[PDB]
């Protein structure tokens, strides 16, 4: 999935530039998820990749909920 | 002895209170240089004291 | 005519003379000798008394 | 004992109506090229540095080094000129266009009179005039200093209507007082030599650094003690939008560069900061404590 | 030409000193009156009391 | 020019009678005013009177407190003379307890105007300020006329007492463990960047360091966090041109033995503040740095 993998690697990097500008109820609670998002990278083992994306998505899908002030 | 001859200015937090009481008007940005004749009646915090 | 009415208030300033009265020896004014401090603007030395 | 001064004499005769014009400037700065004791009027004032081709930056760069001096007392046949000492308050006349509030940090700048005439002419004397430097608040100097640098970068682009309009907008500063438009450095379709050299000093620093710094940042980012040079490697990219799905993953770095020329490019990067240094850092020369009514005299503690 | 100026400066100091002492007496009157204007209720207050 | 004339020792003004006495001796007139001795005649301190409205006098009745002008937009209130304490409510360094403590003390429209004019501007805080020196001789009326020192020592009239600089304890910081015999006081605003607004954090950093380069080098030590956050905001936001991350201005000097804690006492509200005692003022200027 390399050709799609690079597009995912770009879209994760864009997500933080979007999340940084938009005002948040909690400046510091979202800091954890944004730093988790900055730390994404793909390990030399292919098998770790599915984990990374998982820890990527817990980083984002939760954060977007704070975006709409959803509980 | 009627409770309130005008409810829109007599209530605490009525429109003209938040518009003329200086302690409310402070929460809003405003020019202090302008002189407002009504303020002396609605500056409740200073007349309570 | 929309529903509400207005009750404009307006302060007005009158220049006026005013006549004071005070009793004999109502108050004392203890005073000291005047004194002269010196300042220098280098174009002219103001003094203060 | 007498105050120390600098006597000045006028080779050309003075009229009774002329000497009255000096009593007006009795409390005004008069820059001198060099500390001396007796001075002819020729060496007096900024007029000796007027040029046709040379522009605003020549005046600024020589004005940094001239010895500031107030006029002290007209004598009819002579003129005293006290040299201010650092840390003592001196009154100054408000030659600058802008009114000074108390506490302002003033600084000296070349005169920047614009096209339509206003009060300018005072002391024509034998094909000679006593031009006087503007005294202006520090922020207005910081702003004028940039307006000219940007009109210089636009001096190459007067074909475009958008630049043609933006230049006009930079031309007229809007300050907390009556406004004073700034004269355009460009003239006769061609930029003056000083602004051209200064714009080169800026654009060399803007361009020579981009190709050079990667060879060093790539090596420094390894250590990690500071912990931001890795973030700075991405700052080198100079991309505005988020990266496409294409080339960029690392900044562009020079290839193979011959062993010695890298020293010459490096040192030429540092030679341009020296040309830029006269404009990089303005310096306060007075700090006004109180101002006279009508903002005409002020009493500033001297700095420098 | 110079004795003129030596005498004129001395006249200037004496003039500026006589006028300052005079202004001092008027300022003493002025401040004593300001004090009475701060220690004098309006008529209707004293009349009611 | 006689050989004896250069040989004479310099003549101090006290040896000669006062210039007013030199006129009165010649003309013999005797005013009511006592011009026999001039007050304030021995003052290396340079000073200036500033009218400050009564809403800002609190915590300034104590002599010794910075005066800082604050330019804001509106042409009617061209400026406003903030204390150092009043600026502490905006600072992020200050304790929330101290902030909520002293914020009650500034319950005046004149002071609340200062918070509003601080919030109002997009441009950075360090631009709007210009330090004026230190309070002394509060005129203390319906509108105080504060005397402020531009240079020299703070002290009483007649030099009967030396006013001391008071710096709220949360702003005071020392880099070094072994204090020098003399040390300079510098005021340091430091922006730490953040999404909705770049909140400022004020400090006052006494140090024996005088050289600018070595000073800023040691400063980037503690402020690496703010500097890296500025670099991170620089890349996080395109077409955003945030400038300098701390700004240092030389505020004066003190002998470093004088430094010791104290408290201001106002409205029965004790406030712990460090107390430079014989603090000579020698103003500098804000020096941008990354």
From Swiss-Prot, chain A:
Disulfide bonds: none annotated. It comes from the Viruses. Phosphorylated by host CCNA2. It is found in: Virion tegument; Host cytoplasm; Host nucleus. Participates in the last steps of viral maturation and release. Associates with nuclear capsids prior to DNA encapsidation and later preserves the integrity of nucleocapsids through secondary envelopment at the assembly compartment. Interacts with host CCNA2 and thereby blocks the onset of lytic gene expression to promote establishment of a quiescent state of infection in undifferentiated cells. Belongs to the herpesviridae large structural phosphoprotein family. Interacts with host BICD1 and RAB6A. Interacts with small capsid protein UL48A; this interaction links together the capsid and pp150. Interacts with host CCNA2. This is Large structural phosphoprotein. It comes from Human cytomegalovirus (strain AD169). The chain holds residues 73 to 143 of 1048 of the full protein.
UniProtKB/Swiss-Prot annotation, chain B:
This is Major capsid protein. Belongs to the herpesviridae major capsid protein family. The lineage of its organism: Viruses, Duplodnaviria, Heunggongvirae, Peploviricota, Herviviricetes. The chain holds residues 1225 to 1273 of 1370 of the full protein. It comes from the Viruses. It is found in: Virion; Host nucleus. Homomultimer. Makes the hexons and eleven out of twelve pentons. Interacts with triplex proteins 1/TRX1 and 2/TRX2; adjacent capsomers are linked together in groups of three by triplexes, heterotrimeric complexes composed of one molecule of TRX1 and two molecules of TRX2. Interacts with scaffold protein; this interaction allows efficient MCP transport to the host nucleus. Interacts with capsid vertex component 2/CVC2. Interacts with the small capsomere-interacting protein/SCP. Self-assembles to form an icosahedral capsid with a T=16 symmetry, about 200 nm in diameter, and consisting of 150 hexons and 12 pentons (total of 162 capsomers). Hexons form the edges and faces of the capsid and are each composed of six MCP molecules. In contrast, one penton is found at each of the 12 vertices. Eleven of the pentons are MCP pentamers, while the last vertex is occupied by the portal complex. It comes from Human cytomegalovirus (strain AD169) (HHV-5).
UniProtKB/Swiss-Prot annotation, chain D:
The keyword Lyase does not apply. InterPro entries: Herpes_capsid_2. Its main location: virion. GO terms for cellular component: host cell nucleus; viral capsid. GO terms for molecular function: structural molecule activity. The keyword Nucleus does not apply. It comes from the Viruses. It holds the Pfam family Herpes_V23. Keywords: Capsid protein, Host nucleus, Virion. Interacts with TRX1 and major capisd protein/MCP. Belongs to the herpesviridae TRX2 protein family. This is Triplex capsid protein 2. It comes from Human cytomegalovirus (strain AD169) (HHV-5).
Curated annotation (Swiss-Prot), chain F:
One of its GO terms (molecular function) is DNA binding. It comes from the Viruses. It is found in: Virion; Host nucleus. Keywords: Capsid protein, Host nucleus, Virion. One of its GO terms (cellular component) is host cell nucleus. Belongs to the herpesviridae TRX1 protein family. HAMAP family: HSV_TRX1 (MF_04018). This is Triplex capsid protein 1. It comes from Human cytomegalovirus (strain AD169). The keyword Transferase does not apply. Structural component of the T=16 icosahedral capsid. The capsid is composed of pentamers and hexamers of major capsid protein/MCP, which are linked together by heterotrimers called triplexes. These triplexes are formed by a single molecule of triplex protein 1/TRX1 and two copies of triplex protein 2/TRX2. Additionally, TRX1 is required for efficient transport of TRX2 to the nucleus, which is the site of capsid assembly. InterPro entries: Herpes_1. GO terms for biological process: viral capsid assembly. Interacts with TRX2, MCP and capsid vertex component 2/CVC2.
